[PDB]
């Protein structure tokens, strides 16, 4: 049951740190194998460049039939991540498949920083700035990157 979820979490870990996804680290933070920490580096081409961003990950008892709870603990200026570090990502909600792995989530989150989605935004203010004034969006993103993520 949870022993099943655990065998799967250990597999994902072993698979991971022995072939990490580009610009991310992730792993258990204690002896509790259901609670992970992760980092995503700001992608090279983005205003987040050079930032290190910390995430929290909670795996459910019936993984991977339910997705993990994933959040930012680093403050970040982005249309699809709120001030609580909640991420608007389909594959974490309605579009979750048990075929997905943490590698794929982190890769997916990283892409989201490379390229935000303003159309159905979680923070409609930042969404607006992005669509109307890009120069501004970068400045604030980089500025936030400098305050919070370096």
């Amino acid at each position: 049951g949870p022993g099943s979820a655990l065998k799967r979490i250990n597999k994902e870990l072993s698979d991971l740190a022995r072939d990490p996804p580009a610009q991310s680290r992730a792993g258990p933070v204690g002896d509790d194998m259901f609670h992970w920490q992760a980092t995503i580096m700001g992608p090279n081409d983005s205003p987040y460049q050079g930032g290190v961003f910390f995430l929290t990950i909670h795996f459910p008892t019936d993984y991977p039939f339910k997705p993990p709870k994933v959040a930012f603990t680093t403050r970040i200026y982005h249309p699809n991540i709120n001030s609580n570090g909640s991420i608007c990502l389909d594959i974490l909600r309605s579009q979750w498949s048990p075929a997905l792995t943490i590698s794929k989530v982190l890769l997916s989150i990283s892409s989201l920083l490379s390229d935000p989605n303003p159309d159905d935004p979680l923070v409609p203010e930042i969404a607006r700035i992005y669509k109307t004034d890009r120069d501004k969006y970068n400045r604030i993103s980089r500025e936030w990157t400098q305050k919070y993520a370096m």
Binding site: S4, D62, S94
Partner: protein
Amino acid sequence: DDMCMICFTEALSAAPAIQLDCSHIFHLQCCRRVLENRWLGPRITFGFISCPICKNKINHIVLKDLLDPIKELYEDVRRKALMRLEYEGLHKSEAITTPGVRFYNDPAGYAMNRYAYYVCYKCRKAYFGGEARCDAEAGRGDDYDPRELICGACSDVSRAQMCPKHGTDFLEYKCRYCCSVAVFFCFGTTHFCNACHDDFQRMTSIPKEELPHCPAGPKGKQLEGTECPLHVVHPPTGEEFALGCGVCRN
């Protein structure tokens, strides 16, 4: 390899396995769990029935017991959604008629994306719960109680005058506290929209005359302006009100 691509815990060689109509192969026992769990949270979605891999619907003789009630719910919802989209006059919508956008030529697809449906606990049919917000879609998971989801007909607190065309099949209520279609029905008396339910402790406490008046947003906001979001006359915020049949005014 011989790895089961649902639970990466295995080679298929290990226990009961099956090949879906789609072609690729999984543990029988894994496919069943995927189909028993259904969707995440209260709002009916059908992501879970596609193939982990090729994302064509999962199909098999051995799985018909699970798939059968699902196809019927999917049918029910596709039906209700597509109807609502047409009535709402959004089937000609540009997000359907533009080649290379997500739901090009997919009116049903667009509508089921746009609308939020819930399984009623009393009867067992889907009912409409409003446009799907993003804010609800990065909120809780299943820290919710299915007994509190109840279609308009099963929560008729306003002994409402039925629609001659569609009986009570598409009857919907206002949130008690704002100008939104309701989703939940708690303490067998009180209809709440998604946001107000989240915050029901507060909402219940606010004195009735201190609530926002029409036009009223969730969680106590006063929306600017003069036209009601529901395009209806209704009693002041804080009183129950049956909105009527959902298709026939939309």
